[PDB]
Write a protein that binds this ligand. Structure first.
Ligand SMILES: COCCNC(=O)c1nc([C@@H]2CCCN2C(=O)COc2ccccc2)[nH]c(=O)c1O
Ligand SMILES: [Mn+2]
Ligand SMILES: [Mn+2]
Length: 180
């Protein structure tokens, strides 16, 4: 999986993922499913912002967690949006709401229900590796072409992993994390 990740993701994304794991005391060379999951989620967050104008989004994911909370506080202080209890992935400057992005190897609606349970003003948008998506109130934020690019990328990743016999382990690892 190490070779797959370094071959299919931008070096900057790989390095941010390595950094994140090291800060959490994890080895990218050992927890390789997590390594790929982090890369995939960060890439999706970048592709999501590309779906709006350059004025539309603040990307919160992939930044120093301590500093990210100060940006969240500045947004909440200036816009009057309620402060989220959990650090989100994006802020939408147009709709003035935070966004939580889910990327799951599980079923999109089960994942949505759990995320919603764990989260009230944050908008939730879930993507799968099988071309499915789910979003709060069926409000998908982006146009269909921007979302098609995301779904297509994730579908492509699943096929590439499957051809290297990595998909089944990657799939099961999200469920093992949920079981524990
Ligand atoms: C990880 O803790 C630092 C802040 N966590 C996030 O921001 C975040 N966490 C997760 C899931 C649920 C709780 C922990 N976790 C994972 O370890 C899965 O892998 C990821 C790790 C980081 C980013 C994306 C995926 N799911 C997301 O969608 C997400 O945005
Ligand atoms: Mn996040
Ligand atoms: Mn997320």
């Amino acid at each position: 999986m190490e070779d797959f990740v370094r071959q299919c993701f931008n070096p900057m994304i790989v390095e941010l993922a390595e950094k994140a794991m090291k800060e959490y005391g994890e080895d990218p060379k050992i927890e390789t499913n997590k390594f790929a999951a982090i890369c995939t989620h960060l890439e999706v967050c970048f592709m999501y912002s590309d779906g709006g104008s350059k004025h539309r989004f603040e990307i919160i994911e992939g930044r120093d967690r301590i500093m990210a909370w100060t940006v969240v506080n500045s947004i909440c202080n200036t816009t009057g949006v309620e402060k989220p209890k959990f650090l989100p992935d994006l802020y939408d400057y147009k709709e003035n709401r935070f966004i939580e992005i889910g990327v799951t190897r599980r079923e999109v609606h089960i994942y949505y229900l759990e995320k919603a349970n764990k989260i009230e003003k944050t908008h939730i948008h879930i993507f799968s590796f099988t071309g499915e998506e789910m979003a709060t109130k069926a409000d998908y934020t982006l146009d269909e072409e921007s979302r098609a690019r995301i779904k297509t990328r994730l579908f492509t990743i699943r096929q590439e992993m499957a051809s290297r016999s990595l998909w089944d382990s990657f799939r099961q690892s999200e469920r093992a994390a949920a079981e524990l």
